[PDB]
Amino acid sequence: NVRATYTVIFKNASGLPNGYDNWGWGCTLSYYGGAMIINPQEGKYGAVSLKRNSGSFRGGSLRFDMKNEGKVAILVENSEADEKFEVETISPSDEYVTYILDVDFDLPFDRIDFQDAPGNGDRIWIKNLVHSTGSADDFVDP
Ligand SMILES: OC[C@H]1O[C@@H](O[C@H]2[C@H](O)[C@@H](O)[C@H](O[C@H]3[C@H](O)[C@@H](O)[C@H](O[C@H]4[C@H](O)[C@@H](O)[C@H](O[C@H]5[C@H](O)[C@@H](O)[C@H](O[C@H]6[C@H](O)[C@@H](O)[C@@H](O)O[C@@H]6CO)O[C@@H]5CO)O[C@@H]4CO)O[C@@H]3CO)O[C@@H]2CO)[C@H](O)[C@@H](O)[C@@H]1O
Number of CB atoms found within 10 A of residue 57's CB: 22
Residue 67 has, within 13 A of its CA and on its CB side, a CA count of 5
Report the topology of domain 1-142.
Jelly Rolls (2.60.120)
DSSP letter string over the chain?
--SPPEEEEESS-SSSPTTEEE--BSEEEEEETTEEEEEEPTTS--EEEEEESS--B-SSEEEEEEEESS-EEEEEEETTTTEEEEEEEE--EEEEEEEEEE---SS-B-EEEEEETT-S---EEEEEEEEESS-STT----
* C-alpha of residue 26 to centroid of ligand 1, in Å: 9
Q: Which of 106, 122, 5 is nearest to 114 (CA)?
A: 122
Q: How was this structure determined?
A: X-ray
Any atom of ligand 1 within 6 Å of the Cβ of 27: no
Number of CB atoms found within 10 A of residue 53's CB: 9
Any atom of ligand 1 within 6 Å of the Cβ of 34: no
Protein residue with its CA nearest to atom 17 in ligand 1:
84
Q: Where are the domains of the chain?
A: 1-142
